[PDB]
PDB file of C-alpha atoms in Angstrom:
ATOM      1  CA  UNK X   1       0.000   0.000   0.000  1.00  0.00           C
ATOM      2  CA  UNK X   2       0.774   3.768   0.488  1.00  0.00           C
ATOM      3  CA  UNK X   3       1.786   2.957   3.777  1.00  0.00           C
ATOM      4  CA  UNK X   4       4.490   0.972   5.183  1.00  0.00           C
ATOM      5  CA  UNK X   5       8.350   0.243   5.443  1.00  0.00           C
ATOM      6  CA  UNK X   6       8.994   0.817   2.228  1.00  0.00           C
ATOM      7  CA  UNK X   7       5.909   2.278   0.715  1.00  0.00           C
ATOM      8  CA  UNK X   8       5.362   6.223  -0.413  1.00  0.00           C
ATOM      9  CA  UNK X   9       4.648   6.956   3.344  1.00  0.00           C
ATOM     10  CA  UNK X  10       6.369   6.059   6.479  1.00  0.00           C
ATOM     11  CA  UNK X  11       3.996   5.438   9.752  1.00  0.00           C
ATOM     12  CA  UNK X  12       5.155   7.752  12.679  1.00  0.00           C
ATOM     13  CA  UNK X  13       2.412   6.527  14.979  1.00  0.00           C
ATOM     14  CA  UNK X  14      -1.831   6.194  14.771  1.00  0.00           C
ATOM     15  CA  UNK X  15      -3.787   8.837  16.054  1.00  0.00           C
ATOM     16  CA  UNK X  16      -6.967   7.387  15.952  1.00  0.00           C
ATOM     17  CA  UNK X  17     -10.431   5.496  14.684  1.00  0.00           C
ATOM     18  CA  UNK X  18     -12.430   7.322  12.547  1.00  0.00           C
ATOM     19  CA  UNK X  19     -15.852   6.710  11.410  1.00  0.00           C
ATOM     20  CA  UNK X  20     -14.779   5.258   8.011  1.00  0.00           C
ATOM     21  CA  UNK X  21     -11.081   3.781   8.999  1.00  0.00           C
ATOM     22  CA  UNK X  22      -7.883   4.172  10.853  1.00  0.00           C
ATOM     23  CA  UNK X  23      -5.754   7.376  10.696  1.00  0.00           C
ATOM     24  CA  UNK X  24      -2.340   7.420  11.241  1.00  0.00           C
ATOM     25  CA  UNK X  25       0.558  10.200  11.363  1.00  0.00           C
ATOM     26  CA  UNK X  26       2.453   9.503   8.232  1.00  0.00           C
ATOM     27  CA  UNK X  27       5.908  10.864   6.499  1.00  0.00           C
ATOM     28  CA  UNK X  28       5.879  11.432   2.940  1.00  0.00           C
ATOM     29  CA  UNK X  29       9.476   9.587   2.033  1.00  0.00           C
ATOM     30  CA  UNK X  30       9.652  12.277  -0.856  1.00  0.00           C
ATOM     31  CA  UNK X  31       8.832  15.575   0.356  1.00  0.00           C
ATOM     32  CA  UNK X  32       9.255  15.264   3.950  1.00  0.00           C
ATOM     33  CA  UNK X  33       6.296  16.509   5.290  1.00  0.00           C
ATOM     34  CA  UNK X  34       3.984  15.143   8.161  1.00  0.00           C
ATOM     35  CA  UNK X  35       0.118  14.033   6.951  1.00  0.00           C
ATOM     36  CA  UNK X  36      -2.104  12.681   8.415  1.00  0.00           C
ATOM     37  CA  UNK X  37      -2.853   9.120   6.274  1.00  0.00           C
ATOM     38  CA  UNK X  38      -6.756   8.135   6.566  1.00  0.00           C
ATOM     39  CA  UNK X  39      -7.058   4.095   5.632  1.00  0.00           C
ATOM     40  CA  UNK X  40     -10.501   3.585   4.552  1.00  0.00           C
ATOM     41  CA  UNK X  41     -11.526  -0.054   3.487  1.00  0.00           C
ATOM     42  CA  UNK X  42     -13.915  -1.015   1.126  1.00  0.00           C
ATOM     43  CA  UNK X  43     -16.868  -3.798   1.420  1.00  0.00           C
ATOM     44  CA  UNK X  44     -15.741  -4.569  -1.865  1.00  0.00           C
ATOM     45  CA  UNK X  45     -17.662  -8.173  -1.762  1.00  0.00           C
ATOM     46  CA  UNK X  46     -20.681  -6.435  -1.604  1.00  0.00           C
ATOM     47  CA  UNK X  47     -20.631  -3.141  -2.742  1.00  0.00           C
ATOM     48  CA  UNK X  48     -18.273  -2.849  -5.947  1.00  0.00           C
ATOM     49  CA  UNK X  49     -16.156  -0.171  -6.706  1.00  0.00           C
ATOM     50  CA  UNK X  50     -17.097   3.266  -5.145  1.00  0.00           C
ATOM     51  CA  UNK X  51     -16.398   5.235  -8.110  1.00  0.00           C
ATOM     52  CA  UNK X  52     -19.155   7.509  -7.548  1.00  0.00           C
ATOM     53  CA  UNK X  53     -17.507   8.281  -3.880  1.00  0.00           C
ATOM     54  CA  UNK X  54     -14.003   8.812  -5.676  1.00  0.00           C
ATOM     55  CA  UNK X  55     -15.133  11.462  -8.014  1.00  0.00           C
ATOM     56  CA  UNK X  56     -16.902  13.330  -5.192  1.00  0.00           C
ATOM     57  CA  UNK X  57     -14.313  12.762  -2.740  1.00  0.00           C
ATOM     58  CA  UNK X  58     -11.355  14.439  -5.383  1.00  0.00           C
ATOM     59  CA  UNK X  59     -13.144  17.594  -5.989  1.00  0.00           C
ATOM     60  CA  UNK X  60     -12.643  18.429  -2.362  1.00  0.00           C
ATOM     61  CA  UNK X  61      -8.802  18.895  -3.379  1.00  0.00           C
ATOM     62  CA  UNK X  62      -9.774  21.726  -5.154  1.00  0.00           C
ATOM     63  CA  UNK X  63     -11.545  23.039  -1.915  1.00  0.00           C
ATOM     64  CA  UNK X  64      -8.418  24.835   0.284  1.00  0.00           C
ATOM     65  CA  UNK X  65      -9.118  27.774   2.738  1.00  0.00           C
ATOM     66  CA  UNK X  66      -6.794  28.453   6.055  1.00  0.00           C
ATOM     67  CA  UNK X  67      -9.859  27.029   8.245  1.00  0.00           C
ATOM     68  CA  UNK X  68      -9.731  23.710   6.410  1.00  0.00           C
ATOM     69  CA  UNK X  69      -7.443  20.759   6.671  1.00  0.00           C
ATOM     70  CA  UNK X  70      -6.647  20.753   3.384  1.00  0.00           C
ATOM     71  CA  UNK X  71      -7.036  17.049   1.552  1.00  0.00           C
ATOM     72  CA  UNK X  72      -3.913  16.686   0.202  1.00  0.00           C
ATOM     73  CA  UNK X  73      -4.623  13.385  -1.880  1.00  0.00           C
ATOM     74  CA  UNK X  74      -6.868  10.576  -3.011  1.00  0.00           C
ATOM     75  CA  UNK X  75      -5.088   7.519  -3.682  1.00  0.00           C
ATOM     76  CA  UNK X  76      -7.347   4.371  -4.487  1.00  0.00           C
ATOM     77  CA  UNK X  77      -5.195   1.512  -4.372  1.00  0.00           C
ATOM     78  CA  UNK X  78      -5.100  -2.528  -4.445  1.00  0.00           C
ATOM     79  CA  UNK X  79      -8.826  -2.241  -3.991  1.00  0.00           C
ATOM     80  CA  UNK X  80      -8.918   0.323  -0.770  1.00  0.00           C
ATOM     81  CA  UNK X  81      -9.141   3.959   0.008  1.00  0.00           C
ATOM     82  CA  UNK X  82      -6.452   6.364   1.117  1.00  0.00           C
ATOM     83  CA  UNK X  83      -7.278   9.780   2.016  1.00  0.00           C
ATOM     84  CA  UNK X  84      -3.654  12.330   3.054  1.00  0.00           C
ATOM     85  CA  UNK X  85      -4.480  15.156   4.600  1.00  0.00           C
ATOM     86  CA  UNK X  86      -2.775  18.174   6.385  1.00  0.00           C
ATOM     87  CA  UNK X  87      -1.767  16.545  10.083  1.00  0.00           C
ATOM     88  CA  UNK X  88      -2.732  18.953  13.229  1.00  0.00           C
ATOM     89  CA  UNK X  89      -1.422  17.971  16.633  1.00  0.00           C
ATOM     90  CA  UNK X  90      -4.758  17.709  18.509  1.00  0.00           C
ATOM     91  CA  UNK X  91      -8.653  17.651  18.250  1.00  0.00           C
ATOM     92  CA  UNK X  92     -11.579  19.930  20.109  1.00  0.00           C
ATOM     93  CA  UNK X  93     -12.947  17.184  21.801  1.00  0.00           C
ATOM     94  CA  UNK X  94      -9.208  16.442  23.324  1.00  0.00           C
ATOM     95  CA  UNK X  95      -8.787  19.783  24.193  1.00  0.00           C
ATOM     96  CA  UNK X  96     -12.061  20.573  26.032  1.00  0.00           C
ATOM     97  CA  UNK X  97     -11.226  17.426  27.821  1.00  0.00           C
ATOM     98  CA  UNK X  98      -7.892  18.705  29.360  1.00  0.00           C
ATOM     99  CA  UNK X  99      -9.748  21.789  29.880  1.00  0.00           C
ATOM    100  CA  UNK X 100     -12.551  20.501  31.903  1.00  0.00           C
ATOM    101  CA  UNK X 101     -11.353  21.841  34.810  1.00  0.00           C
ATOM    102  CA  UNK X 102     -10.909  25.233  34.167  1.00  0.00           C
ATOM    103  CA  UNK X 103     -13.135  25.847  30.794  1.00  0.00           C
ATOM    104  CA  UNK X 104     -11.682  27.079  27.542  1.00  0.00           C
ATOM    105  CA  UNK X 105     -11.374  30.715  28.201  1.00  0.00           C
ATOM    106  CA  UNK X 106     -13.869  33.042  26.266  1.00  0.00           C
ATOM    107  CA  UNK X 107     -11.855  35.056  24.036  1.00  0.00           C
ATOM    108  CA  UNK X 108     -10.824  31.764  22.339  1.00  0.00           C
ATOM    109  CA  UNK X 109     -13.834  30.183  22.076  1.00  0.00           C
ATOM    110  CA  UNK X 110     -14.952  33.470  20.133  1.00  0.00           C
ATOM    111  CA  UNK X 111     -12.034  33.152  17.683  1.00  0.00           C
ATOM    112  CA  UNK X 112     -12.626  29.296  17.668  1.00  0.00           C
ATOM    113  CA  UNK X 113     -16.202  29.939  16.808  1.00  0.00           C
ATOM    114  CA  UNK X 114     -15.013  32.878  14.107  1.00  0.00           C
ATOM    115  CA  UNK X 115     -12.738  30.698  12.885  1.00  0.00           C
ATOM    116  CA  UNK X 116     -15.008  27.700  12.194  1.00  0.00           C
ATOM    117  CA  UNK X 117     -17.599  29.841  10.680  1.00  0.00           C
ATOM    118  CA  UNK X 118     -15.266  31.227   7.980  1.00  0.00           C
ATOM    119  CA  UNK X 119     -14.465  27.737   7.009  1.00  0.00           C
ATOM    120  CA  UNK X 120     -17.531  27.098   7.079  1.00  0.00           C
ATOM    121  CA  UNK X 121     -18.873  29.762   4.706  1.00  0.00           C
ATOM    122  CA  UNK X 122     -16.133  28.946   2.530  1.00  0.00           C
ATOM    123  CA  UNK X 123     -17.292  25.187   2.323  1.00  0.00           C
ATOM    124  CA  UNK X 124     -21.072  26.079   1.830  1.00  0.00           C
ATOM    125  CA  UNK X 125     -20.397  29.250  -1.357  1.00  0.00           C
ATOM    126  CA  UNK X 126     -19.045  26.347  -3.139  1.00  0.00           C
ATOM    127  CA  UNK X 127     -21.949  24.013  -2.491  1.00  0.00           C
ATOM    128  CA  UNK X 128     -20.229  21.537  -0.132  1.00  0.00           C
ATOM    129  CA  UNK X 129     -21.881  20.108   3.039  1.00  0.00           C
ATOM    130  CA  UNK X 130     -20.371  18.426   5.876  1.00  0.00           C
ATOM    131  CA  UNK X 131     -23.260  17.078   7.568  1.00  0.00           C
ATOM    132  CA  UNK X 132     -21.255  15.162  10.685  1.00  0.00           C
ATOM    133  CA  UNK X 133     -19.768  17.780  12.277  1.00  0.00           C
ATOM    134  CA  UNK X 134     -18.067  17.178  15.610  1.00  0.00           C
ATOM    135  CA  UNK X 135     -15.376  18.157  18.178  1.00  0.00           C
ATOM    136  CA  UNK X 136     -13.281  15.082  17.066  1.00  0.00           C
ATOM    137  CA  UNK X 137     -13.215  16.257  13.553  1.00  0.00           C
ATOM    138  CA  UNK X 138     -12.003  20.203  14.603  1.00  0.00           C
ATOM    139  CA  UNK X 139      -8.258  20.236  15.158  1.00  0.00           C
ATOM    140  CA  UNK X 140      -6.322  23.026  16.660  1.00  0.00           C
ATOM    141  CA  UNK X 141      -2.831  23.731  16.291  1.00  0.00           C
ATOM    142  CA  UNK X 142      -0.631  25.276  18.390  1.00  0.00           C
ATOM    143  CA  UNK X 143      -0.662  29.230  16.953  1.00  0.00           C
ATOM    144  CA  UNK X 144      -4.537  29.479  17.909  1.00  0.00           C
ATOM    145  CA  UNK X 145      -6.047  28.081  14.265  1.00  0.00           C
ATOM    146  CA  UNK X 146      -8.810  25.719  14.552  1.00  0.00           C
ATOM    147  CA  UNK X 147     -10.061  23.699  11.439  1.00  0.00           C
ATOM    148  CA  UNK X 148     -12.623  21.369   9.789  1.00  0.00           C
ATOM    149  CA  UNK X 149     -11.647  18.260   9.229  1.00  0.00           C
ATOM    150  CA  UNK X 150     -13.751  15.600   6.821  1.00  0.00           C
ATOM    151  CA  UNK X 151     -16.046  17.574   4.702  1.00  0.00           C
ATOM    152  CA  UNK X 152     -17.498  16.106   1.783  1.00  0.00           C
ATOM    153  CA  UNK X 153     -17.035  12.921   3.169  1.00  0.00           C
ATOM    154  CA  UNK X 154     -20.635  12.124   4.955  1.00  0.00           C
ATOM    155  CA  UNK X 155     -22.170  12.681   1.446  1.00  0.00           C
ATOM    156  CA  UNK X 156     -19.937  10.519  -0.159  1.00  0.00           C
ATOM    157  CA  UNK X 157     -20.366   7.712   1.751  1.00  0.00           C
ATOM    158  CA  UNK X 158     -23.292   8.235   3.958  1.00  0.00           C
ATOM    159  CA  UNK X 159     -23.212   8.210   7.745  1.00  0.00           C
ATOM    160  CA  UNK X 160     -23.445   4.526   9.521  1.00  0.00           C
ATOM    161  CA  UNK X 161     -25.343   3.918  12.690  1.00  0.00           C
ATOM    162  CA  UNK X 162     -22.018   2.144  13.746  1.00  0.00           C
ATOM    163  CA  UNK X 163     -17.706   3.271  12.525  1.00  0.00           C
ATOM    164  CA  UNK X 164     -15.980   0.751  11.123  1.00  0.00           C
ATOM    165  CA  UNK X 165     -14.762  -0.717  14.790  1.00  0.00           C
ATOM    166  CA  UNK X 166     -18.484  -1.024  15.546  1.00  0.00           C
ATOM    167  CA  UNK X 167     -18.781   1.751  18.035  1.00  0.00           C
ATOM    168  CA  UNK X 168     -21.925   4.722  18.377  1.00  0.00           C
ATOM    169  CA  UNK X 169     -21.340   7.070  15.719  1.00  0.00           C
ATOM    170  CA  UNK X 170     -22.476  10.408  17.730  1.00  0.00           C
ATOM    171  CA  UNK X 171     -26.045  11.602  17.411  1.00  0.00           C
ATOM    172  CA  UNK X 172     -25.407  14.784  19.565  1.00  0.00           C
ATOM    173  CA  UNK X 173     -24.863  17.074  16.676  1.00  0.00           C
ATOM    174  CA  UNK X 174     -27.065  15.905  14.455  1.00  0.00           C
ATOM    175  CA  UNK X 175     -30.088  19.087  13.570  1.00  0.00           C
ATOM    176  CA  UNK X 176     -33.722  18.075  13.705  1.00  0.00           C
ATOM    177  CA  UNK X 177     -34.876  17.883  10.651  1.00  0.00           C
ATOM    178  CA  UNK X 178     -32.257  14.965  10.029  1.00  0.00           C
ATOM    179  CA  UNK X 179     -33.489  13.242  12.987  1.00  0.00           C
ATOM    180  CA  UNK X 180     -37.188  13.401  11.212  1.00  0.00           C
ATOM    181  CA  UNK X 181     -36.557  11.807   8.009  1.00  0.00           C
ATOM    182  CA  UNK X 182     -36.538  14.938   5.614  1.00  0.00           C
ATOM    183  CA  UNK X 183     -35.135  14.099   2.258  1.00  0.00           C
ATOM    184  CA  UNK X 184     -32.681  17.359   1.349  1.00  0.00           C
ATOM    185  CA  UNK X 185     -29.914  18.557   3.957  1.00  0.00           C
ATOM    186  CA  UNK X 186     -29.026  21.979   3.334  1.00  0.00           C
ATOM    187  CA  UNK X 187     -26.013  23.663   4.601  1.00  0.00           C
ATOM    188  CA  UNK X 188     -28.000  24.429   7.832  1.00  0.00           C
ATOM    189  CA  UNK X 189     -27.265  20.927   9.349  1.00  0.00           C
ATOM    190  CA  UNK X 190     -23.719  22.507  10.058  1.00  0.00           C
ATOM    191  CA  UNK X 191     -24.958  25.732  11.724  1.00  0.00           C
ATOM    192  CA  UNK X 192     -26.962  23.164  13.859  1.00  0.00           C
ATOM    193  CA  UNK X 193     -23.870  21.154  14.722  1.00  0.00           C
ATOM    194  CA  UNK X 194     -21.504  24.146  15.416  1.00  0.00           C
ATOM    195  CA  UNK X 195     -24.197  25.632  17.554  1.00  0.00           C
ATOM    196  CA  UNK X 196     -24.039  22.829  19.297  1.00  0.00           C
ATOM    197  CA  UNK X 197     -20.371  22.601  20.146  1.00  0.00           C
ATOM    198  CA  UNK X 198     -20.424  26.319  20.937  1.00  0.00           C
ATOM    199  CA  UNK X 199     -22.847  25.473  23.692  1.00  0.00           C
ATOM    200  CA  UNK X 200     -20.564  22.777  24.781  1.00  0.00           C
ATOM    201  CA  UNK X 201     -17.339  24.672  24.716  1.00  0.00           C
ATOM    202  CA  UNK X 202     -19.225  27.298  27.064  1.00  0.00           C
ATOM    203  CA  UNK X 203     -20.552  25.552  29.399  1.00  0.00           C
ATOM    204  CA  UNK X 204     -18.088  22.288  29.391  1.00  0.00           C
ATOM    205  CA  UNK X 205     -20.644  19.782  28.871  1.00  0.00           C
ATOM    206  CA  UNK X 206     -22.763  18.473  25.735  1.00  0.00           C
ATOM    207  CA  UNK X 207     -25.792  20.230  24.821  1.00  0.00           C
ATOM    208  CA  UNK X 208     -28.131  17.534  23.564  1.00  0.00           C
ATOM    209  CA  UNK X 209     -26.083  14.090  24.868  1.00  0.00           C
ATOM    210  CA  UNK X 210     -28.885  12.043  22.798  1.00  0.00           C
ATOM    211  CA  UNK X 211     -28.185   7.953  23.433  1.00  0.00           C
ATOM    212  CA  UNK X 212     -30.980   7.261  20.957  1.00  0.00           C
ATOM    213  CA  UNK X 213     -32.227   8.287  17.933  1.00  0.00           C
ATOM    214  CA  UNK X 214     -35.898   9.260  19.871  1.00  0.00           C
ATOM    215  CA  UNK X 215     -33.807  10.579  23.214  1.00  0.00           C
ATOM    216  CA  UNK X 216     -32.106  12.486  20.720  1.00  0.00           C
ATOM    217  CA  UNK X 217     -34.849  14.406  19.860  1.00  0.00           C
ATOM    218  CA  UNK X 218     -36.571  14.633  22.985  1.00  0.00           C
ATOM    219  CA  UNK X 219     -33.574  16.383  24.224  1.00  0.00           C
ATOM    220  CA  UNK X 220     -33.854  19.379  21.323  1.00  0.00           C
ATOM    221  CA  UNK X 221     -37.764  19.445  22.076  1.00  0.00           C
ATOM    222  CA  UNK X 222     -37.141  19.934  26.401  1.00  0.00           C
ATOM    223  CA  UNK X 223     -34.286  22.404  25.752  1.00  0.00           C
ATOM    224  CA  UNK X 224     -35.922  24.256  22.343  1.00  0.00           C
ATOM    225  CA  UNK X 225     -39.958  23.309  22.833  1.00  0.00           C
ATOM    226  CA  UNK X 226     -41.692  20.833  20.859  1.00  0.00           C
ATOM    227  CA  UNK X 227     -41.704  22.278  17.257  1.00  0.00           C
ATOM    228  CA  UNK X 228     -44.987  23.173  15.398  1.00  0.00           C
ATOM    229  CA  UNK X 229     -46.097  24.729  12.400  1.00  0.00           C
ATOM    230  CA  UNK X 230     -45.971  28.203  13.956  1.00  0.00           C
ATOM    231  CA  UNK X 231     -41.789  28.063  14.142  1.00  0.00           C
ATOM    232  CA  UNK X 232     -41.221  25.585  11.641  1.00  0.00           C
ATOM    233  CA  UNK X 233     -43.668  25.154   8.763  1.00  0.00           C
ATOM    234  CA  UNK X 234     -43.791  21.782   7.830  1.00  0.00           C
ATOM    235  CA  UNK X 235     -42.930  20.199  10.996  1.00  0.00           C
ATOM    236  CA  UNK X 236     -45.991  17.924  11.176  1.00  0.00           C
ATOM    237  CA  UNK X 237     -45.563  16.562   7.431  1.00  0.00           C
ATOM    238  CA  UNK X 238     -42.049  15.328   8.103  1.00  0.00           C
ATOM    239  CA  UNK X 239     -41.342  11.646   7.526  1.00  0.00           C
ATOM    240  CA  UNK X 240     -41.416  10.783  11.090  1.00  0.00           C
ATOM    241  CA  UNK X 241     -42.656  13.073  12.581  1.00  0.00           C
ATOM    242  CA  UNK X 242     -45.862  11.752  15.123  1.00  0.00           C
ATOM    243  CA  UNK X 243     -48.539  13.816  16.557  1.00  0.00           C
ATOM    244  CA  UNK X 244     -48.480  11.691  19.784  1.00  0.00           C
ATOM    245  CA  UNK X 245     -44.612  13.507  20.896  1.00  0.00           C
ATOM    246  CA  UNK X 246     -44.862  15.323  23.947  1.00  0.00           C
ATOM    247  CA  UNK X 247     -45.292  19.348  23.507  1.00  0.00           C
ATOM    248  CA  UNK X 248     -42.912  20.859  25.947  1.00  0.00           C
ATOM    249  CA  UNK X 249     -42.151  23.924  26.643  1.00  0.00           C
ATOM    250  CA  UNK X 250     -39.463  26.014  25.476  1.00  0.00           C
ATOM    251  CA  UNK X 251     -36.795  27.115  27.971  1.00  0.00           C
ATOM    252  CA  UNK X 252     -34.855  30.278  28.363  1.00  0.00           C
ATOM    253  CA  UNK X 253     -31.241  30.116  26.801  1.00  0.00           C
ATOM    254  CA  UNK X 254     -30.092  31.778  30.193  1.00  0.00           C
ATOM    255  CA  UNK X 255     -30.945  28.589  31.438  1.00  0.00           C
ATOM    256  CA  UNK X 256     -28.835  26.519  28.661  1.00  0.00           C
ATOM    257  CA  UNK X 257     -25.787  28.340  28.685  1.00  0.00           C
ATOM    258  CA  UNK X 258     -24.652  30.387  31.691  1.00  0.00           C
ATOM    259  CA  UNK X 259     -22.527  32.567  31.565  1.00  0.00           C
ATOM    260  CA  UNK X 260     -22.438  33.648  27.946  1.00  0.00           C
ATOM    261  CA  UNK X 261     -23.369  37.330  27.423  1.00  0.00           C
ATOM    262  CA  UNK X 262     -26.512  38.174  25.650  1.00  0.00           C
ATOM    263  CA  UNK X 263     -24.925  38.612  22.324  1.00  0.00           C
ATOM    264  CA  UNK X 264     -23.805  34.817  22.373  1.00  0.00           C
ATOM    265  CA  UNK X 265     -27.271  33.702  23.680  1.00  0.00           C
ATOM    266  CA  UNK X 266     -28.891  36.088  20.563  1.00  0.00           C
ATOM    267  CA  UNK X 267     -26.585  34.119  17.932  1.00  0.00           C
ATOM    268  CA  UNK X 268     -27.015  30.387  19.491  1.00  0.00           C
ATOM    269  CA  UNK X 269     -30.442  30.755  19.318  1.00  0.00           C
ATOM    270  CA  UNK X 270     -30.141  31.677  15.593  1.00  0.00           C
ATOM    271  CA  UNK X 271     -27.735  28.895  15.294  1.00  0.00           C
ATOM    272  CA  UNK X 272     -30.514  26.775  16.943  1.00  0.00           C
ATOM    273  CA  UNK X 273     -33.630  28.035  14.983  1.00  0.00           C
ATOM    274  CA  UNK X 274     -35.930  24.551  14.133  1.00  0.00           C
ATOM    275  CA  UNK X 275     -36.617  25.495  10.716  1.00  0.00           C
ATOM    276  CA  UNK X 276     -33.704  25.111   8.378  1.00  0.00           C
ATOM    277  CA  UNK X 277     -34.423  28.228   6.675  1.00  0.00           C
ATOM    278  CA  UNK X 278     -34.292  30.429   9.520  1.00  0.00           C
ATOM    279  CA  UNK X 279     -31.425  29.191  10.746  1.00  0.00           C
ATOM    280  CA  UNK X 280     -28.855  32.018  10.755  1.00  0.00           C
ATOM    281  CA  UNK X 281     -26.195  31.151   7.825  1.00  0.00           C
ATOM    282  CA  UNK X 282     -22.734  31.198   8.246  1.00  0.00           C
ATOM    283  CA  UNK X 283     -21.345  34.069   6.572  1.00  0.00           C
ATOM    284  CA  UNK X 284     -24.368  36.026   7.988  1.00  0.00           C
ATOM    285  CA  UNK X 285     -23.312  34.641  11.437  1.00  0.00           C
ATOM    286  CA  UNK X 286     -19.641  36.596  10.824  1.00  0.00           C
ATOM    287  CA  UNK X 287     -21.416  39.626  10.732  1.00  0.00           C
ATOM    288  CA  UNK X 288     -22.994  39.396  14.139  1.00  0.00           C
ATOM    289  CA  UNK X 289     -22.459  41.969  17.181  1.00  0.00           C
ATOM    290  CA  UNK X 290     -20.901  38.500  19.191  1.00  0.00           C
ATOM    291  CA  UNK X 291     -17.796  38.977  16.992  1.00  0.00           C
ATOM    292  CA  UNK X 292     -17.520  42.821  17.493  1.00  0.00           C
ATOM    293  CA  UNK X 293     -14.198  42.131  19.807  1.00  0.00           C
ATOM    294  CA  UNK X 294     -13.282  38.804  18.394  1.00  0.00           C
ATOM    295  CA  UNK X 295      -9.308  38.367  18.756  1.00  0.00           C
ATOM    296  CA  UNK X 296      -6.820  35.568  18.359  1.00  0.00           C
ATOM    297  CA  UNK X 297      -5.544  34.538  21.175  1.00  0.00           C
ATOM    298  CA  UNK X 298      -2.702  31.745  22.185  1.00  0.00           C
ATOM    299  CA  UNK X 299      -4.116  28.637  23.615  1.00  0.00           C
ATOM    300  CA  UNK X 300      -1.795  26.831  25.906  1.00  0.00           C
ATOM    301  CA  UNK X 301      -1.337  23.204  24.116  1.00  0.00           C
ATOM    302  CA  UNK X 302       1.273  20.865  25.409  1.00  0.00           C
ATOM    303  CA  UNK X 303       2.411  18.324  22.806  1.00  0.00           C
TER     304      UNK X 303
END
């Protein structure tokens, strides 16, 4: 393969499991440089050739902005997939770990937040979705960059109930209207998502931590209020959607994310709006009075 003793690429070490295969921190034998080497296999038995997924999957080399690890090569070889990709030293999820204690200070979860909506308005003016956003698939670098990781791959291959070494693929960023069966994502799903791992950064702790498709759902409708057609038009027509949920009531965003400053609580809950077109978009979110001070601040990474 691509990888190996005495292949293209020289393993340094594996850095994790992803939903779709193994990724490892890799040395390009030619140029030097440090990637990270994604090793996705292929249910070839079954499936075929995934030359649909291929096609899609190269166009994103095309796709390079400063907020987005930058997909540095498709290689499909000997019947698997390879993706290389710009290496980071450490994820969001990693780092609000370590910072459980103490909380990610505010100042850089504003640029964070800045940050990830740039990249995201990048991704979304040239028509590409994410759709799985997720702190594991942010990765932060020493200087104080943050960026997406992954996009374009959800849609290429769809999202499994279960990764590839059979654990829970997350539901708790996944936006409503997913949840109820609609037939077309639009770029809102990841305004949903990031909303949601604002609220987490903020207050330390998940915002919706769903263990179930339905608990998912119930969690958005206790936090948000059980949607109707007022607020989201359509609501009731949704594939699975049932009259026979419980209508709670919606709760105050003072409530969901202390201490954040009324400007932050103004743009989550724009970031958090049920229907898909209301939901704020991402280059509008860049405009909004939360970002009047936004700086870029150091964070304090030990590697």
């Amino acid at each position: 393969g691509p990888l190996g003793s005495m292949e293209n690429f020289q393993k340094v070490e594996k850095i994790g499991e992803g939903t779709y295969g193994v990724v490892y921190k890799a040395r390009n034998k030619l140029t030097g440089e440090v990637v990270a080497l994604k090793k996705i296999r292929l249910d070839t038995e079954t499936e075929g050739v995934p030359s649909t997924a291929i096609r899609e999957i190269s166009l994103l080399k095309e796709l390079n902005h400063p907020n987005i690890v930058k997909l540095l090569d498709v290689i499909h070889t000997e019947n698997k997939l390879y993706l290389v990709c710009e290496f980071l030293h450490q994820d969001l999820k990693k780092f609000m770990d370590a910072s459980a204690l103490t909380g990610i200070p505010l100042p850089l979860i504003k640029s964070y937040l800045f940050q990830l909506l740039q990249g995201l308005a990048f991704c979304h003016s040239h028509r590409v979705l994410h759709r799985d956003l997720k702190p594991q698939n942010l990765l932060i670098n020493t200087e104080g960059a943050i960026k997406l990781a992954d996009f374009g791959l959800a849609r290429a291959f769809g999202v499994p109930v279960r990764t590839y070494t059979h654990e829970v693929v997350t539901l708790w960023y996944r936006a409503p209207e997913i949840l109820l069966g609609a037939k077309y994502y639009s770029t809102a799903v990841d305004i949903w998502s990031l909303g949601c791992i604002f609220a987490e950064m903020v207050t330390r702790r998940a915002l919706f931590p769903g263990d179930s498709e339905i608990d998912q759902l119930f969690r958005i409708f206790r936090t948000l209020g059980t949607p109707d057609e007022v607020v989201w038009p359509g609501v009731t027509s949704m594939p699975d959607y049932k009259p026979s949920f419980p209508k709670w009531a919606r709760q105050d965003f003072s409530k969901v994310v202390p201490p954040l400053d009324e400007d932050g609580r103004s743009l989550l809950s724009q970031m958090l709006h049920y229907d898909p077109n209301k939901r704020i978009s991402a280059k509008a979110a860049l405009a909004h009075p939360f970002f009047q001070d936004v700086t870029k601040p150091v964070p304090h990474l030990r590697l």
